[PDB]
Amino acid sequence: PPPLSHCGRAAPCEPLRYNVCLGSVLPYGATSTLLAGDSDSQEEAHGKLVLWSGLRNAPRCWAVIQPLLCAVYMPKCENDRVELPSRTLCQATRGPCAIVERERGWPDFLRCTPDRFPEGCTNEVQNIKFNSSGQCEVPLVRTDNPKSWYEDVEGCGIQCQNPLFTEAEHQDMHSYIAAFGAVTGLCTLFTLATFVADWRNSNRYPAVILFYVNACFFVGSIGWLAQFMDGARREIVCRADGTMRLGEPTSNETLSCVIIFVIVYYALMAGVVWFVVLTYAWHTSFKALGTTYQPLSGKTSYFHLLTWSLPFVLTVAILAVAQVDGDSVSGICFVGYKNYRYRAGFVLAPIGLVLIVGGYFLIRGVMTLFSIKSNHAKALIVYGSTTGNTEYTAETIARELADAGYEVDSRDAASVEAGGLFEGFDLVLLGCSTWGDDSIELQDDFIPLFDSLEETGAQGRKVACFGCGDSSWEYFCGAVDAIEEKLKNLGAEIVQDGLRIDGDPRAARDDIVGWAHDVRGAIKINETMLRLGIFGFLAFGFVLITFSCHFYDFFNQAEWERSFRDYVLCQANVTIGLPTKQPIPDCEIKNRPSLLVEKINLFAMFGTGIAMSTWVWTKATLLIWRRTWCRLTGQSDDHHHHHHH
Amino acid sequence: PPPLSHCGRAAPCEPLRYNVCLGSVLPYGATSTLLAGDSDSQEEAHGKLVLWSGLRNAPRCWAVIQPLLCAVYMPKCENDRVELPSRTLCQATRGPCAIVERERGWPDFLRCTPDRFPEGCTNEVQNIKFNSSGQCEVPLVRTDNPKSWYEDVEGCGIQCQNPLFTEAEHQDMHSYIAAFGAVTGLCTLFTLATFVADWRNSNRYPAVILFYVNACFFVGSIGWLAQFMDGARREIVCRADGTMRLGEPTSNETLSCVIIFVIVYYALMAGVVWFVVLTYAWHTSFKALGTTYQPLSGKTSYFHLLTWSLPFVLTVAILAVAQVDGDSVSGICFVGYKNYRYRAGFVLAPIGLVLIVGGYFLIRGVMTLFSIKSNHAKALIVYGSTTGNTEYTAETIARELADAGYEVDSRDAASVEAGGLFEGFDLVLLGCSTWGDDSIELQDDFIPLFDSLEETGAQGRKVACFGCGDSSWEYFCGAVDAIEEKLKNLGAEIVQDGLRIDGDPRAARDDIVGWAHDVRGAIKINETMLRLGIFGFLAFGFVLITFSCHFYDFFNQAEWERSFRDYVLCQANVTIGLPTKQPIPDCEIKNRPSLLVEKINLFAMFGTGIAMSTWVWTKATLLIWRRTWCRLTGQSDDHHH
Ligand SMILES: CN(C(=O)c1ccc([N+](=O)[O-])cc1C(F)(F)F)C1CCN(c2nnc(-c3ccnn3C)c3ccccc23)CC1
Ligand SMILES: CN(C(=O)c1ccc([N+](=O)[O-])cc1C(F)(F)F)C1CCN(c2nnc(-c3ccnn3C)c3ccccc23)CC1
Ligand SMILES: Cc1cc2nc3c(=O)[nH]c(=O)nc-3n(C[C@H](O)[C@H](O)[C@H](O)COP(=O)(O)O)c2cc1C
Ligand SMILES: Cc1cc2nc3c(=O)[nH]c(=O)nc-3n(C[C@H](O)[C@H](O)[C@H](O)COP(=O)(O)O)c2cc1C
């Protein structure tokens, strides 16, 4: 067909000084510099192409901009007429070459004007094959998937390995996760094993909480350790093409990322909710005996309801807003690595709420603990002393109890009536020296009390004895033996082994102080519940450190994301306008996340699991597996244990 | 020949109003009352002869005084001359008629004066035969033998049958001696037979004392039972003539009395000396229990020296002073029946001496009973307690064992190492409470000990278990069951069934005290030493009763001997010359020996032998006569090989 008048412009033809345009040979021999507005000569047109060739980086732009640049700077001129490039050739660059309008801006002669670029014209460059493809820079990787391209740079995608941290820092962090993960995995596994080895007896509701607390940290450990199997880490953190996994759940990608996300986050949130249960349980167990509250042993349908539903609602909500992001250095998929606000919302806020609710019950339980001890602070000290040594011991014991918060009433046996003497005291300390040359004779003033000791109200009373004697005599502190014996026959609860002073009690003052310290120590305020309280405050400590680390990351990640963008886009090269002074990359990370804070975070996190596994580190546990061995050997034959077997 | 002038006196002859003198006819018809100084007429002379005829009793005197009294009161007067009695007729009465000079005294005309009774004259009464011999009253008997004559009554002797006791009382006493004698004879014979039946093992010197103690009461029984042989009693208690045997040995009399005396008295004194040996042996043996030291070892020789020589010296001394007296009611010859002082000297005094010496060693032995012993008992109490109930039980058991003399070491199972833990204890008491909801689980602190219980040294150890539990739980004190099952499988000796407390031990304190008491009991002690001590005090009791009875007889026989003399001399009558002055005979016993005291004496004597024969009344004796029948039949514990 003959050429159209509007698909050509009148221009004086000049012979081509260059027989090649951006690596491809030209079929014609005459050109024009009329289409190029910035160029007047072929030498200048060639010079501009060397500046435009800076777009090799971002290849899906480079592939479409090569034909357009050859159709404008080096076009076909034949019989004093230059061919115009079609509108379709110009419009094909607008999209993938957005970076041009974003950085420099399309010049007057390269904007798709119907005057400069007419509709339905033969391009001539359509016949010419441009085999040049381009390449992506070191922090980016070529990806075909459009859902993996990084911002403006179409054709390239952000690599899987986090570019803010070196390979040395990756190896260092993975070694740290392997160490804590394995210890936490093993310790919790031992605790879950001993509980199921005594499952029918260990289901008692005050301690069964520590079983589920360990169960969460056990499942959590599996999520963090999954990355160490051969090749798993890249199946969890890298996409099929090779770019890092962002905004999961995402289409046409394996579940490996969301599976590990659920295991880590759900076990994290189920664990912190079981913490609030532990703090609540210790708090309410006191008022079960003290005032009116009744045992909570049977709230299986209420604690399991809230501990397993709240993490479920949160995990489903994260998958819905699809903010599950993968990370090579942490080796797991978690909520809010790309966008810090989601990590703050679904992690920092729930951990903050469990600290104020859980912290409230620790305060309440302690206030209950201290009010009960003040209601059990009356103590009677009755002493029988001739030369004043037991009197001195009684008075020494009295100040130690008083310094500890008791209301001490010290009385001489010579001035007391036996009838209902011990009525109204939480503790009764009876002191008497030993006399009698051939035998055991009590100090004279204590005989009337000792003979009518049945009328004192010793039955069920918490008592302890003391007394002064001399090893130089036969039957050392025989009176202490006799009083302990009559009190024990009347039904009194002997708190500790009688304090028997040899010689002068002043030269044994700290022994008296030491005994009086231990005698209050033996005054139990639920031994079974006390341990539940240490573990409550212990867990709170580690949860508070975890919250602090997430707060640091929340308060600074806005700057690190900006620093991430500025570094990758600068490393992408693609500097079209002019060439830099040296080929040097001239690119830095102004600020990045702190790996220390993350190690402190994992220490507090995994550390809770290790600390809670020590709940079953008692003598009772040794007997649990003893039964398991003894009656695994006793069950090696037929049937099992019996009444006389 | 013509009659001599000095064999006759001038007197007026008067015809005889009485033709008979003391039962004999007179050849002459004229008499005189000149020779009789107390008589003036024939009626008065006849009257005096009736008073002199009171001497029919004491016939030795009556036979010789009849001719003299007829020659003085009714003499021959012929041609105004009365015949004088010869000196020989008068001198013949002086001796056998001593009673006359002892009671009234010979009158002036009956003393042998050469003036009143000249030498060599025809008596005339020499031709006259006096057939009258006289008599001996009921407690006396006529005896030819001079030695048997009793006191002043020559011609009579005290009968064999004791006149103070009736025939009914003799039969009653002989029946009592026959009963005890036979039982004591049989019982001791069985005991002597059993020691001989197994003489090698029973010849141990703490026990063989009881063999010789029985040997004495056996020989003694033979002496008391010998009287029951047909007519043996009268050969032992009566002399050949028929009078009771007094102050023997006596000439021309059988040994039957001294033979029975030796058998009874020697066996009595050998027995009471063997008692002092028994009291000494227990005293020294019980003292030497804390060591191997054997105290009696060389004393064996010295015991036989003392026990067999002292009775011999005494028996010989009694035969020397010859105070062996026979008695019909006791039926045996013994020392001091006639004279109480010899019975007191040779019986009461030695029995008194054996009581103070023998009593001393019984006291010394009870002093050893309450003295500190060299050997004490060691006991270990290991307890496993969570709420302190088994700890309380352990301490309650401890204080009870300690009150009994044990050295109790009470330890908590939580603070002990199982390795050689029971080493050095006589008794080990393990205590443990039961725990576990579905099964039997021991108190937590006892598990380490229970699992390494093989290393404690329980093999052959005497053990007993205890523990607290609650019936409200399925397996009541299952830990007590498990511990005594493992101890029994290791070879420990379970002393008693485990003390299993239901609920609070404080409300069952005396049950714990009671169990602890019974645990000590099942520990075997020296039953032979114990038993020797009981037989020592048993024998002392009976010896003390025997002494009491001999003391009664000693303190009163002086009166009974006086009563014996007064009654016998009364029954027989003498009356030398008295019109008796209207009297009442009233001849009776004022006081006699008590037969009750004698029965109490024999009961305590024979009773000692019966009590000491019980020494061989044990289960071992049944086995001794078991082996004896088999060994003599030839066969062993089945058939001989
Ligand atoms: C997110 N991020 C980035 O580098 C990052 C990635 C992509 C973009 N972007 O724009 O595409 C931006 C960024 C930036 F701006 F740098 F944040 C860091 C990754 C590493 N790191 C960790 N964070 N949490 C945990 C941890 C503790 C307890 N539980 N968990 C889950 C953790 C555990 C171990 C080791 C490290 C951890 C800190 C944040
Ligand atoms: C002696 N006498 C006379 O009657 C007696 C005889 C003669 C004259 N006299 O003057 O010629 C005086 C008296 C008189 F004065 F009455 F005593 C009694 C005889 C009987 N009797 C006994 N005596 N001992 C024992 C006995 C106990 C333990 N061992 N034995 C040896 C004994 C045992 C059984 C039964 C009786 C016994 C008491 C004394
Ligand atoms: C007569 C006498 C008997 C004594 N008996 C004993 C005794 O059996 N055991 C003992 O340990 N001390 C015994 N002692 C020592 C006293 O117990 C000792 O001096 C004590 O410190 C007195 O204390 P007091 O002032 O309370 O009476 C005895 C002292 C005396 C002088
Ligand atoms: C969990 C439990 C289990 C028990 N099991 C038993 C048992 O099997 N048999 C038994 O007789 N008592 C059983 N008891 C009761 C104790 O044996 C009882 O209270 C005892 O007095 C404890 O004594 P202690 O102070 O020596 O430990 C059990 C008590 C508890 C609380």
Author numbering:
A (entry chain A): 58 to 433, 1002 to 1148, 444 to 565
B (entry chain B): 58 to 433, 1002 to 1148, 444 to 561
Paper excerpt:
The activity of SMO is suppressed by the PTCH receptor, a 12TM protein.
We determined the structure using room temperature data collected at an X-ray free-electron laser (XFEL) source at 2.9 Å resolution. At the same time, we also solved the structure with data from 12 cryo-cooled crystals collected at a synchrotron source at 3.0 Å resolution. One of these ligands, TC114, with the 4-nitro group substitution, was predicted to form an electrostatic interaction with the protonated ɛ-amine of K395. Therefore, we conclude that TC114 stabilizes the multi-domain SMO by keeping helix VI in a stable conformation that in turn enhances the hydrophobic interaction between the extended ECL3 and the CRD hydrophobic groove. The overall SMO structure shares a canonical GPCR 7TM bundle fold with an amphipathic helix VIII running parallel to the membrane plane.
